[PDB]
Amino acid sequence: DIIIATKNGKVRGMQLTVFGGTVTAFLGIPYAQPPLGRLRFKKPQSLTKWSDIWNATKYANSCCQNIDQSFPGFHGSEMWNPNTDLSEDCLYLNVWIPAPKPKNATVLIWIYGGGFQTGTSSLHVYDGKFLARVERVIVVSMNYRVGALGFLALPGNPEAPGNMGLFDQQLALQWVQKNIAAFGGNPKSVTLFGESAGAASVSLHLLSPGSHSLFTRAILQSGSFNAPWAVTSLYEARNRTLNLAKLTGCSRENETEIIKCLRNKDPQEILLNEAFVVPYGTPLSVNFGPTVDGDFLTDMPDILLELGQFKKTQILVGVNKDEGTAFLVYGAPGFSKDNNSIITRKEFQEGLKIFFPGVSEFGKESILFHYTDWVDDQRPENYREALGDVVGDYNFICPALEFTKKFSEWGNNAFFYYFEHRSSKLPWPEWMGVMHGYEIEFVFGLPLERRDQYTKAEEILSRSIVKRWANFAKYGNPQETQNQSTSWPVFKSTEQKYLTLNTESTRIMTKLRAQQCRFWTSFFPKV
Amino acid sequence: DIIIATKNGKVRGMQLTVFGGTVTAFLGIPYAQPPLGRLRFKKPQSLTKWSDIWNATKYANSCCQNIDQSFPGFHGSEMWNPNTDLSEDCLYLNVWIPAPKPKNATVLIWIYGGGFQTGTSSLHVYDGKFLARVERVIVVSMNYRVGALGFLALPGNPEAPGNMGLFDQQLALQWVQKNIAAFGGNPKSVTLFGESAGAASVSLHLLSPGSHSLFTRAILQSGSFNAPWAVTSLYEARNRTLNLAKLTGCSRENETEIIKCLRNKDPQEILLNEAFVVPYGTPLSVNFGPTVDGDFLTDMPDILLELGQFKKTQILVGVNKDEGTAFLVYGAPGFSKDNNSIITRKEFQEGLKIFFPGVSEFGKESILFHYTDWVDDQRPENYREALGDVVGDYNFICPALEFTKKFSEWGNNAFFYYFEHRSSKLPWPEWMGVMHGYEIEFVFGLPLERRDQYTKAEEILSRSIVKRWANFAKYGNPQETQNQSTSWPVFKSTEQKYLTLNTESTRIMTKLRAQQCRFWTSFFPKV
Amino acid sequence: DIIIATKNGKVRGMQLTVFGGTVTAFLGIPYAQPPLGRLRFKKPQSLTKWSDIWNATKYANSCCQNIDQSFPGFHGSEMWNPNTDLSEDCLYLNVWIPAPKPKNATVLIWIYGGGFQTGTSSLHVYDGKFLARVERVIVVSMNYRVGALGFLALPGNPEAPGNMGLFDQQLALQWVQKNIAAFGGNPKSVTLFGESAGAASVSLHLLSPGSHSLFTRAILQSGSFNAPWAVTSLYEARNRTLNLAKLTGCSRENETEIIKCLRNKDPQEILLNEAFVVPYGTPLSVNFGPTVDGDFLTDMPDILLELGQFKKTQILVGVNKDEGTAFLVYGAPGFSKDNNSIITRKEFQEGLKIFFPGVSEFGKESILFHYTDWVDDQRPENYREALGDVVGDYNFICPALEFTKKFSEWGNNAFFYYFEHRSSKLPWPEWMGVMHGYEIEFVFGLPLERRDQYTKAEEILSRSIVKRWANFAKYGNPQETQNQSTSWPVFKSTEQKYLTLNTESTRIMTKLRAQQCRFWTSFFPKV
Numbered sequence A, B, C: 001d002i003i004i005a006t007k008n009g010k011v012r013g014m015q016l017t018v019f020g021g022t023v024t025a026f027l028g029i030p031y032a033q034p035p036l037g038r039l040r041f042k043k044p045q046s047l048t049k050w051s052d053i054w055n056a057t058k059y060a061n062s063c064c065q066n067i068d069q070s071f072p073g074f075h076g077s078e079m080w081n082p083n084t085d086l087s088e089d090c091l092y093l094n095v096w097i098p099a100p101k102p103k104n105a106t107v108l109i110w111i112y113g114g115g116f117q118t119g120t121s122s123l124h125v126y127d128g129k130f131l132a133r134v135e136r137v138i139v140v141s142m143n144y145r146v147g148a149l150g151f152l153a154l155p156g157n158p159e160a161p162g163n164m165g166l167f168d169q170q171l172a173l174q175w176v177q178k179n180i181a182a183f184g185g186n187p188k189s190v191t192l193f194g195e196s197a198g199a200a201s202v203s204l205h206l207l208s209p210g211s212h213s214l215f216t217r218a219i220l221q222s223g224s225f226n227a228p229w230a231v232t233s234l235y236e237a238r239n240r241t242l243n244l245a246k247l248t249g250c251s252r253e254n255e256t257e258i259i260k261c262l263r264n265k266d267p268q269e270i271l272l273n274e275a276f277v278v279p280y281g282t283p284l285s286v287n288f289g290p291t292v293d294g295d296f297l298t299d300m301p302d303i304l305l306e307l308g309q310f311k312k313t314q315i316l317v318g319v320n321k322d323e324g325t326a327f328l329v330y331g332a333p334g335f336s337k338d339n340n341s342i343i344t345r346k347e348f349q350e351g352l353k354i355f356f357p358g359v360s361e362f363g364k365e366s367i368l369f370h371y372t373d374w375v376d377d378q379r380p381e382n383y384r385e386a387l388g389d390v391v392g393d394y395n396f397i398c399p400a401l402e403f404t405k406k407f408s409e410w411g412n413n414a415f416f417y418y419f420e421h422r423s424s425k426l427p428w429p430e431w432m433g434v435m436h437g438y439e440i441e442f443v444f445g446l447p448l449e450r451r452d453q454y455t456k457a458e459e460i461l462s463r464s465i466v467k468r469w470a471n472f473a474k475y476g477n478p479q480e481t482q483n484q485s486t487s488w489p490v491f492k493s494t495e496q497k498y499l500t501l502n503t504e505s506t507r508i509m510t511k512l513r514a515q516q517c518r519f520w521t522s523f524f525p526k527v
C-alpha cells in the first residue's frame, strides 16, 4: 500500500510489475477545480484540499473533444482516440515513480499533441511506467482542455481570455513544483517533452514568463509554435468565436452575454459546430488554438523568438522522415491507406488546393515549381511523394529547423534529430513511410517489452533513445556514453549538424532539407 | 591542559613535542552512533551529545576486517595491518592542530585505502602531527566501515542499502564542517586526500551531491573510481550478498529477513566468508565495495564523469612508478619477495590467468601481445617487469590519467605527478621498485624526522612535497615558490604535462604511458 | 559650530579657510583604548563610548619613537620629526571634510612611513585640507604604534603577538567603515594611500583577510612589502625581542614573564635599546617591523603574492628618480649634505659594507661589477651616483616594479609612475636629486598655495597629480581628462608601460631599470 501526502491531501497509488521490478503509478490525481458551469472557458482555478485518501488507481476522464471516425475498426487511427470517458471534468494528471521510491529523481512531464483539438494523457503509447522502471526517472502527464473549451478567445475578456488549455498545462507544472518532492522527485530538474501540438505547447512554455521557473529544459518532437498551424491571430480568433455564437444561437450585442449563452449550451452543441467556424479547413486545421492573449503570451511569438525573449536553457528538437503522409488520406484526392495512392499531376494540383486553401494561384504554382523538378526517371510515385513532402516540410520540418536555429543563436546548446525508422508493427501502408507520431512509442520504451513482437533491432533502438532522452533530462546532454555510440553534436547556426535515428547506423549529417526550407522560410511567407 | 567545546560536548586532547614545537592531538573523538545490533549494515546515525569531557588521548578501535597474514613478522606487510583493537564500535576520528591554536587554518582530511576491505586511520604512516607542526594546517582522519560490514548491498533496501562506509566518511566531513572552527580550522578551506581506495573514495565525494558542500578541493594518490576494482555493479553486489547469506546459513525468501539473520551472526563468521562470495578472486579483489545506490551515487559514475556532473574545483592526482609490483607476490607463480623473481613466458601467461580470471583467451593474448614486444636484448627480467607493468597500468595508472583528462576537460585546473623515488628504508626487495603505498610516508613528512635514518636527499624531497601539498590545499596551486623549484604546470587534454617527483631532478614531462593507456582505455574494455 | 554624532559619541570639529572656501577638520578623534599599562604590546582594544562632546580641534600625541638628531636646526631632516608630544597614548585619527558637508564623498586614508620605527599623521606635508578643498574628497589619517611598542613579537603569544601597529591601522579602517557616513563619506569608496613603510603597510592590507572588506583600492608611493627592509623573519624577530630583554634586565625563563617585565620599563628605556637588538644595522634598518604572525598575515607574503592570494582591485604604484640618495648621508663614508660628496672606488666599496653588512664578499663584488661599468668619460661623480642607485634600486624601485608585475598578472589594472621633479624649495643639496619622500607634498597639494613660493610649473604639476590621484580613488582610473593630458596606460607584464611625472612633459615609457632589476630580482636573492 503506497500512500503519499500532497499539499492538497493524501493520494493512494498502485504497484505495477514492469520487467522484473516494480513501478508505483498514481493515475488521475486532480490538479484544478473541475471547470464546469460558471468556470467553463475561464482559466483553471486552484484546488481546495480533500480530507481523506484520493484513490489514484485509474486513468481519469479525457477532456471533451471530437473523435476521428474516418477509419472505424482500424488500429492505425483508433489508437489515437481517447480511451477513457469524455467529460468537461478532466483536469487530472498521472505520476509514475520507480520503486523503491527515489531520492531526488529527475522529472519528465509529457504534453500530448492532437492539433489542440483532441488528445489525452491515458493513451497506451504515452504510458510512463517503462521510463520510470528503466531510467529511474519520475514521469508526469496531464489532461488539458482542447477545442473551443480549451482555446475559445474574446481577447482581453476574462470570461473567455484564450489559452485556457495552456494555463491548464501551466497549473499542472505548478502542481509538480509544489508536490513532486513528496514523491521523491527533484522540482529543480524537470524536463518538458511533447509531440506535435504538445511540442508546440512546450515551445510556448519557453516563451511564457509564468512558466519560466516551472521547468529546467525542453524536448520538442515534431512541432514548435512557429509552425503555420500553431498560433491563431487575434483577428481570426474573434472571427471564429463569433461564428461559433452564430451557429449556436448565441449571437448577442454584449460580448459577456455571448459567453454566458455559450456557457448554457451542452458540450455536444459546441463540439458539433467547431468544424464550421472557418469557411474552409484542411486536414491540419487548428480552429481553436493558442493566441496572443497578453497573459500567457505577451507578444507575437515570432517577435519574442527573433529578439531572444525566451528561457535560456538546452533544447532537444527533431522530426520524422515522412511527417506529411498521415494527413494525405484525410482528404487529398486519389490517396487511400488501402492502395499505393499513385496520383497524377492534376491530383497533385487538387491536393495543393486542399492543403493551401486561402493561398493565391501564384502561391500554389510556386509550390509545384519547387517540388516537381524530378531526379529523374518517370517514376509513377513522383507526385505522391512530392505531396507528402510539401505537407511535412511546410507544417513540421522547416518550422522545427528554423525554431532550433533561432533559439541556438542566443547562445544555448540545442540538439536536433531526424527519426527515420518505420516500426515493424505499423498498421498503415508502406507508402506512408516513417509517419508523424510513430517515434513516440520508441521514446516511451514500448519496444523494450519483448512480449510485444517488435524486432530485436527495435528493442536496441528504443533502449538507446530512452537513454539519450533521460541523459538529456538529467544532464542536458543527450549522449549514450557506454556503447561506442555516435556522439550527438550541438546544432549551431552555420554548421547545422543533426543526428539520424535508425536501427542500422546513426549518422551525423548537416543542413537537413536545406533547399526546401529556403523555399518555405524565405520565400513562401511573402506569397 | 587543552579542552575544546564541540557541538556534542567537550573533548580533551594531548600535547606532543614535534621538532622543537608543540602539536595538540585529539585522537579517537566519536562522530557517529556505534553501528551495533540493529544499526549493523545501516547508514551511520548522528551522535546524541555527552555531558562531561571526552578524553581523546589515544587512537580508537579500528573497524572489523581480515588481516594480511601472508608474511608474519615482516615489516613490509605488517606496517599496513591494524594497530588498535578491531571492533564494530570504530566510528571515530582524529584531529591534529598546531600550537598555539591557529586562527583559521586550512584543513586536510585523510581517507585511508585498503581495497575497501581493510585499513585504519591510526597507522604510523598516516600520523598527521608532522604536517600540523611544519605547515600549520589541521589534519583530520577517520575510521570508516570496510568489507561487508561497510559495503554489503541489497540495492534500495534501507536495511543494507550499500555504501555505508562512504556514508561514514561523509558524516565525518559533516562533523568537520560543524565543529572544526572550535579547533581553529576554516570549514571553507577543506581539502580531502587519500591513497588507493582512499583516493577512489575522494573521487566519489567529487561525484556525490551530499558531499558537495563539505570540502573545497581534492588530492588523489594512486586511485580513482574509474579504476577496474573500485565500483561493484548492482548485479555482482546482489549476487555477493546472496552468496554471503548462503555461506552463513542465512538464505531466506524475504530479503529483510536475510539481513536480520546476518545481523545475528558474530562479526567473525561474516569476515571468514567474505573471501568466498566470488567464484575466483585476485590479489586486487574488492568483494564488497561502492555500488550505484541511488543515494550517495545517483548514476553510474563513468556517465557522471563523461557528462561533467561533478564538483567543479581543482584536483591533484598522481601515481608511483611501480604500482603493480606489490601485488605479484600475493599469488602470481614464480614471484617471491625473497628472490629476484625471474619468470618465464609460461609463468607470465599463468600470471595473467591469476589477475584476469574472467577474461577471454583472446583478451589475455591481447595483453601479452601488447606488453612483450621487447626493446630488446634477451634480458632475463623481461617477463617479470612486464607483469608488474600490466598490473600497475590496468589497475592504477591508466585509470588515474583518464580520470584527470576527463575531469580537466570541464574547465578546472588539475595537476598530475609521477612519483619515482624508492625509499632508502624500503623492506621489500629491489626488483619491486617504487611500490604502491610508499609515497605516503613522504606526504606525511616522516623523513623530516632526522632521528629516523632516511637520507638527507629524502628529507629535502619530503619537505618539498609537504610544501606543494599544503600550498595546493591552501591556495589551489601546488607550487614550491621559494627554492628555485620546477614550476608544476596544469594538466590539460592535448598536452598532458605532469611533474616527476624524485630526489635528483624534477622534470616536466608529457603523455605518461601513452601507448599502454591507449591499449587499456580504448581497446581492452571491448574484450 | 560643526558637531557630528559618531557611534562612540559626539565630536566637534573646526572650520578652516582654504583657497576662498571652507574645510571642516576634526583633528585627534580617538579610535581605540589608550594602549597603556597591561595593554602595552597587545592588539588595540576598541573604544567604549563617551557621553559629551569630544573636541577634535588639535592634533593628538604622536606615538613614542626615537627622533632623527643627525642634523639639528636643518629643515630637510627636521620636517620629518614629530611635531606633537610623544606618548604611548597616541591612537587617534584626523578627518578633513569639504564644506558644505558632502553627500557620499570618496575617502582617501593616508598611512605615513618612517621605517615602522618613526612617523606621525600630523606633519605639515600630510595636511589633508587641500585635497578636501580642491577635490571634495574626505581625507583620513591615523597615528599607529611604531618600534618595539608597535612591532615587538614573540610569535603566537597574545601578550606580544607582533604587528600591533598594523592592527592599529586596521582598527582605524574599521572606524571609518562604521562612522564615515555621519561625516558625508562613502564607506564603499575608500582608497588607502601611503609612502615608504606607509606604502608597505598598504600592500600588506591587500594581503590581510581582515582588511579585505575595509577599503576599495590602493596607492603605493615608494614602498611595498617585498622590499628587503619591510618584513622581519620569525627567527630574527624572536632574536630581537630576546636581545631587547637582555639589554633591559628583563631576561626570564618564562616568555610571558619577559613581557610582563618589559611592561614595567619606562618607554624611554625601551627606545634607548632598540638600536642595539641587532649586531649591525644600516641607515635602512627596520629593527621591529611586520612579521608573519598567523593573524594579520597568514603566510609569508612572497608566497601569497606569487600564488594570487590578495584582494583583487586596482592599484597605483610609483617611485622617485633618486630614492637611494637621502640614506647615503646617514653613514656612507665620504658623503655629506654640505659638499658634492665625490667619492673614490674605495669609498664606494666601504659604502657597500655599510648598506650590505651581512652579505658575502662575492655578493658585494657582484654589486660593484653590475654598477661600475661606466658609460663612460672618467666623470668624478661616477661612484657617488652608483651608490645612490644601488641603494634606491635594491630597497625601493626594483621591489615596487616586481610587486606591480606580480599583482597585475592576476588580472587587475595597475598604473605605475616614475616621479622625476625636484622641488624648487628642496633644502638638501643638488647631488641628491629627486629624493625619497619629496613627491608627498605634490600629492597633498601644498604647491597649490601660491603664498608658499613654489614655481608656477609646480602649481600645475601638483594640480594635475592631485586630480589623477582623486580620479584613481573615485573611479579606479588615474586620468586627467580635461587638459589634453597624456593618457596613463595600464601596466601589464610584457609591456610594462609607466608614466613619468615632471613639470616639462609627461611621457609614456617602458621597462623602467630593466637591466638593474634583473640583477636585484633574479640574481641577488641567491647570494
Ligand SMILES: *[C@@H]1O[C@H](CO[C@H]2O[C@@H](C)[C@@H](O)[C@@H](O)[C@@H]2O)[C@@H](O[C@@H]2O[C@H](CO)[C@@H](O)[C@H](O)[C@H]2NC(C)=O)[C@H](O)[C@H]1NC(C)=O
Residues within 6 Å of the ligand: A332, A333, A334, A335, A336, A338, A339, A340, A341, A342
Ligand atoms: C486508391 O483509392 C482511391 C480512394 O477511393 C477508393 O478506395 C479504394 C481502395 C476503393 O475502395 C474505391 O472504390 C474507393 O472509392 C481511389 O480514388 C477514388 O477513385 C474513384 C473511382 O475512380 C474516384 O471517382 C474517387 O473520387 C476517388 N476517391 C478519392 C477520395 O479521391 C484511387 O483511384 C485508388 N488508387 C489506385 C488504385 O491507385
Ligand SMILES: *[C@@H]1O[C@H](CO[C@H]2O[C@@H](C)[C@@H](O)[C@@H](O)[C@@H]2O)[C@@H](O[C@@H]2O[C@H](CO)[C@@H](O)[C@H](O)[C@H]2NC(C)=O)[C@H](O)[C@H]1NC(C)=O
Residues within 6 Å of the ligand: B332, B333, B334, B335, B336, B338, B339, B340, B341, B342
Ligand atoms: C623464487 O621463489 C619462488 C617462490 O617459492 C619459494 O620461495 C623461495 C624463496 C624458496 O623458499 C622456495 O623453496 C619456495 O617454494 C620459486 O617458485 C616456486 O618454485 C617451486 C620449486 O621449484 C615451485 O614448485 C613452486 O610452485 C614455486 N612457488 C610459487 C608460488 O610459484 C621461484 O622459482 C624462485 N625463483 C628464483 C629462485 O628465481
Ligand SMILES: *[C@@H]1O[C@H](CO[C@H]2O[C@@H](C)[C@@H](O)[C@@H](O)[C@@H]2O)[C@@H](O[C@@H]2O[C@H](CO)[C@@H](O)[C@H](O)[C@H]2NC(C)=O)[C@H](O)[C@H]1NC(C)=O
Residues within 6 Å of the ligand: C332, C333, C334, C335, C336, C338, C339, C340, C341, C342
Ligand atoms: C665632504 O664632507 C665629508 C664629511 O665630513 C666633513 O663634513 C665637511 C662638510 C667638513 O665639515 C669636514 O670637516 C667634516 O669632517 C668629508 O669626509 C670626511 O673627510 C674627513 C677629513 O678628511 C675624513 O677623515 C672623514 O672620516 C670623512 N667623514 C666621513 C663621514 O666620511 C669629505 O671628504 C668631503 N668631501 C668633499 C669635500 O668632496
Ligand SMILES: *[C@H]1O[C@H](CO[C@H]2O[C@@H](C)[C@@H](O)[C@@H](O)[C@@H]2O)[C@@H](O[C@@H]2O[C@H](CO)[C@@H](O)[C@H](O)[C@H]2NC(C)=O)[C@H](O)[C@H]1NC(C)=O
Residues within 6 Å of the ligand: A235, A236, A239, A240, A243, A244, A246, A247, A276, A277, A278, A279
Ligand atoms: C469569418 O467570418 C465569416 C463567417 O462566415 C461564416 O458564417 C459562419 C457562421 C460559418 O458557418 C462559416 O462556415 C461561414 O463561412 C467568413 O465569411 C465567409 O466568406 C465567404 C467567401 O470566402 C462567403 O462565401 C461567406 O460570407 C462566408 N462563407 C460561406 C462558406 O458561406 C469570413 O471568411 C471569415 N474570416 C476569415 C476567414 O478571416
Ligand SMILES: *[C@H]1O[C@H](CO[C@H]2O[C@@H](C)[C@@H](O)[C@@H](O)[C@@H]2O)[C@@H](O[C@@H]2O[C@H](CO)[C@@H](O)[C@H](O)[C@H]2NC(C)=O)[C@H](O)[C@H]1NC(C)=O
Residues within 6 Å of the ligand: B235, B236, B239, B240, B243, B244, B246, B247, B276, B277, B278, B279
Ligand atoms: C555468483 O553466483 C554463483 C554463486 O556460486 C557460489 O556459491 C557461493 C555460496 C560461493 O561459495 C561461491 O564461491 C560459489 O562460486 C556463481 O556460480 C559459480 O559459477 C561456477 C562456474 O564459474 C560454477 O562452478 C558454480 O555454480 C559456482 N562456483 C563454484 C566454484 O562452485 C556465479 O558465478 C556468480 N556470479 C557472477 C560471478 O556474476
Ligand SMILES: *[C@H]1O[C@H](CO[C@H]2O[C@@H](C)[C@@H](O)[C@@H](O)[C@@H]2O)[C@@H](O[C@@H]2O[C@H](CO)[C@@H](O)[C@H](O)[C@H]2NC(C)=O)[C@H](O)[C@H]1NC(C)=O
Residues within 6 Å of the ligand: C235, C236, C239, C240, C243, C244, C246, C247, C276, C277, C278, C279
Ligand atoms: C641575535 O643574537 C645575538 C645577540 O648578540 C647581541 O647581544 C644583544 C643583547 C645586543 O647587544 C647585540 O648588539 C649583540 O650583538 C647575535 O650575536 C652576535 O654575533 C656576533 C658576530 O656577528 C658576536 O660578535 C656576538 O655574539 C654578537 N655581537 C656583538 C657585536 O657582540 C646574533 O648575531 C643575532 N642573530 C641574528 C643576526 O640572526
Ligand SMILES: *[C@@H]1O[C@H](CO)[C@@H](O)[C@H](O)[C@H]1NC(C)=O
Residues within 6 Å of the ligand: A012, A055
Ligand atoms: C480507496 O481504496 C480502497 C480499495 O482498496 C477502499 O477501502 C476505499 O474505500 C477507496 N475509496 C473509494 C472507493 O472511494
Ligand SMILES: *[C@@H]1O[C@H](CO)[C@@H](O)[C@H](O)[C@H]1NC(C)=O
Residues within 6 Å of the ligand: A103, A104, A186, A188, A189, B209
Ligand atoms: C535535489 O538536488 C538539488 C539540485 O538539483 C538540491 O538543491 C536539493 O536540495 C536536492 N534534494 C534532496 C537530495 O533531497
Ligand SMILES: *[C@@H]1O[C@H](CO)[C@@H](O)[C@H](O)[C@H]1NC(C)=O
Residues within 6 Å of the ligand: A254, A255, A256, A257
Ligand atoms: C454587458 O453585460 C455584462 C454581464 O452582466 C455586464 O457586467 C457589463 O457591465 C455589460 N458591458 C457592456 C460593455 O455593456
Ligand SMILES: *[C@@H]1O[C@H](CO)[C@@H](O)[C@H](O)[C@H]1NC(C)=O
Residues within 6 Å of the ligand: A463, A464, A467, A480, A482, A483
Ligand atoms: C549497452 O549494451 C549492453 C550489452 O552489450 C545492452 O544490454 C544495453 O541494452 C545497452 N545500453 C544502452 C543504454 O543502449
Ligand SMILES: *[C@@H]1O[C@H](CO)[C@@H](O)[C@H](O)[C@H]1NC(C)=O
Residues within 6 Å of the ligand: B012, B055
Ligand atoms: C579524563 O582525563 C583525566 C586524566 O588526566 C581524568 O581525571 C578523567 O577521569 C579522565 N576520564 C576517564 C579516564 O574516563
Ligand SMILES: *[C@@H]1O[C@H](CO)[C@@H](O)[C@H](O)[C@H]1NC(C)=O
Residues within 6 Å of the ligand: B103, B104, B186, B188, B189, C209
Ligand atoms: C576564515 O576565512 C574565511 C574565507 O576562507 C572567512 O569567510 C571566515 O569568516 C574566516 N574566519 C575567521 C578568520 O575567523
Ligand SMILES: *[C@@H]1O[C@H](CO)[C@@H](O)[C@H](O)[C@H]1NC(C)=O
Residues within 6 Å of the ligand: B254, B255, B256, B257
Ligand atoms: C518481509 O519481512 C519484513 C520484516 O519484518 C516485513 O516488514 C516486510 O513487510 C516483508 N516484506 C515482504 C516483501 O514480504
Ligand SMILES: *[C@@H]1O[C@H](CO)[C@@H](O)[C@H](O)[C@H]1NC(C)=O
Residues within 6 Å of the ligand: B463, B464, B467, B480, B482, B483
Ligand atoms: C628551502 O630551502 C631552505 C634553505 O636553503 C631549506 O632549509 C628548506 O627546507 C626549503 N624549503 C622547502 C619548502 O622546500
Ligand SMILES: *[C@@H]1O[C@H](CO)[C@@H](O)[C@H](O)[C@H]1NC(C)=O
Residues within 6 Å of the ligand: C012, C055
Ligand atoms: C569643547 O569646546 C568648547 C570651546 O569653544 C568648550 O565650551 C568646552 O568646554 C570644550 N571642552 C573642553 C575644553 O574640555
Ligand SMILES: *[C@@H]1O[C@H](CO)[C@@H](O)[C@H](O)[C@H]1NC(C)=O
Residues within 6 Å of the ligand: C103, C104, C186, C188, C189
Ligand atoms: C553611496 O554610494 C554607494 C555606491 O558607491 C551606495 O550603495 C550608497 O547607498 C550611497 N549613499 C548615499 C548617496 O547616501
